[PDB]
Amino acid sequence: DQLTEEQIAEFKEAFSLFDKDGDGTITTKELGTVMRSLGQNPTEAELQDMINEVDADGNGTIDFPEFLTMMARKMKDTDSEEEIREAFRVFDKDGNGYISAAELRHVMTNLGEKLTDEEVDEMIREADIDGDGQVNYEEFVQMMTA
């Protein structure tokens, strides 16, 4: 199947929305143009971080092969590899990304369905990859290892 000729032109129409002067490059200044017209005024770091993740060539701009991959993730109704991140970032402190291991005991025993002490005790002892009590997203990657 892959992509048909009619389908190829479809992405070009969507690709042309981010190429005002062509060049096959999606620069930082171009993002600021479209976001202002969409009721957004984000900081420079936000757009700098946004383009950073969706950049694989390393030049700084975005080409079609990177554009095609990011669209497929959007087409998915639910990205199961992102929701766990959002739950961590709700309880995240000052953007460190390293959550205290002792803090998780309270949020699991009381918030939600009140998980039992014995089960959450097994949770922390298996999540003690750090060995000191400051867990991070490294628990998430082993959660989805299979």
Question: CA-CA distance, 54 to 69, in Å (whole number)?
Answer: 9
Q: Is 30 annotated as a binding residue?
A: yes
Q: Is 21 annotated as a binding residue?
A: yes
For the CB of residue 59, give the shortest distance to other proteins in the complex, in Å. Answer: 21
User: What contacts 28, CB < 8 A, 6 or more positions away?
Assistant: 44, 47, 48, 51
For the CB of residue 60, give the shortest distance to other proteins in the complex, in Å. Answer: 21
Tell me whether residue 10 or residue 23 sits nearer to other proteins (CB atom): 10
26 CB-contact burial (10 Å; exposed 0-12 / middle 13-18 / buried 19+): buried
| Residue 112 interacting with other proteins (CB under 8 A) | yes
Question: CA-CA distance, 77 to 80, in Å (whole number)?
Answer: 10
The overall longest dimension of the chain from CA atoms, in Å, is: 61
Tell me whether residue 102 or residue 143 sits nearer to other proteins (CB atom): 143
Q: Is 25 annotated as a binding residue?
A: yes
User: Residue 100: phi, psi to the nearest 5?
Assistant: -65, 140
Q: Is 139 annotated as a binding residue?
A: yes
| Residue 23 interacting with Ca ion (CB under 5 A) | yes
Burial string for 57-89 (b: 16+ CB within 10 Å, else e) reads eeeeebeeebbeeeeeeeeeeeeeeeeeeeebe
| Residue 145 interacting with Ca ion (CB under 5 A) | no
Q: Known binding site: residues? A: 19, 21, 23, 25, 30, 55, 57, 59, 61, 66, 92, 94, 96, 98, 103, 128, 130, 132, 134, 139
Q: Which residues bind to other proteins, rule: CB under 8 A? A: 1-4, 7, 10-11, 13-14, 17-18, 34-35, 37-40, 68-69, 71-72, 74-78, 80, 83-84, 86-88, 90-91, 107-108, 111-113, 115, 119, 122-123, 143, 146
